[PDB]
Design an enzyme around this catalytic site. Structure first.
Site, short mmCIF file in Angstrom:
data_model
loop_
_atom_site.label_atom_id
_atom_site.label_comp_id
_atom_site.label_asym_id
_atom_site.label_seq_id
_atom_site.Cartn_x
_atom_site.Cartn_y
_atom_site.Cartn_z
N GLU A 11 0.79 -1.23 0.00
CA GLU A 11 0.00 0.00 0.00
C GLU A 11 0.82 1.28 0.00
O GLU A 11 0.33 2.32 -0.40
CB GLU A 11 -0.92 0.04 1.23
N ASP A 20 -6.64 6.41 -4.97
CA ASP A 20 -6.08 5.10 -5.05
C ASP A 20 -6.09 4.61 -6.51
O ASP A 20 -6.43 5.35 -7.42
CB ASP A 20 -6.71 4.14 -4.06
#
Ligand SMILES: [Cl-]
Ligand SMILES: [Cl-]
Length: 162
Positions: A11, A20
């Site tokens: 991440e 994202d």
């Protein structure tokens, strides 16, 4: 290596709101704030999650606190899920981390839908599951990460992360 390190690798860590891979507002270590297109809506969920007027920026410590909460929630979600629990219970420690990684990325619902793969994992048919896991939007959209998680299920080792 462990779950935290593993997810921190997949991440990253960002201290300012960002979009994202799906274009959604997120912050920290993959903490989704909202599926809404509104940045304000994002700043709002952020302030509510942190407990202060952040103005869209948080500290490292705050990012880590969110991360801890999210990992905890993921584990707990798996354990409460009737379709997932059994899978998790059957796995070794390395492989359990892989399953938590998937849930953290896609939600328990998301994962629970990989019916056939889950069965395969429960049966310890590693190569077959890896192949089935790959026939997914998940793999096609984030192939590098998915490969790492898949290898982990295939081998029961952390080699993809070393
Ligand atoms: Cl929260
Ligand atoms: Cl990827």
């Amino acid at each position: 290596m462990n779950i935290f390190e593993m997810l921190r690798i997949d991440e990253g860590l960002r201290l300012k709101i960002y979009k994202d891979t799906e274009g959604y507002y997120t912050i920290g270590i993959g903490h989704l704030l909202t599926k809404s297109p509104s940045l304000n809506a994002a700043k709002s969920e952020l302030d509510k999650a942190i407990g202060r007027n952040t103005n869209g920026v948080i500290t490292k410590d705050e990012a880590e606190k969110l991360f801890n909460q999210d990992v905890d929630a993921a584990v707990r979600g798996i354990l409460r899920n009737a379709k997932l629990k059994p899978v998790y219970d059957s796995l070794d420690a390395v492989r359990r981390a892989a399953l938590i990684n998937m849930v953290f990325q896609m939600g328990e619902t998301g994962v629970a839908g990989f019916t056939n793969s889950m069965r395969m994992l429960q049966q310890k048919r590693w190569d077959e599951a890896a192949v089935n896991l790959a026939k997914s939007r998940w793999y096609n959209q984030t192939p590098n990460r998915a490969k790492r998680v898949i290898t982990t299920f295939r081998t029961g080792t952390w080699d993809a992360y070393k």
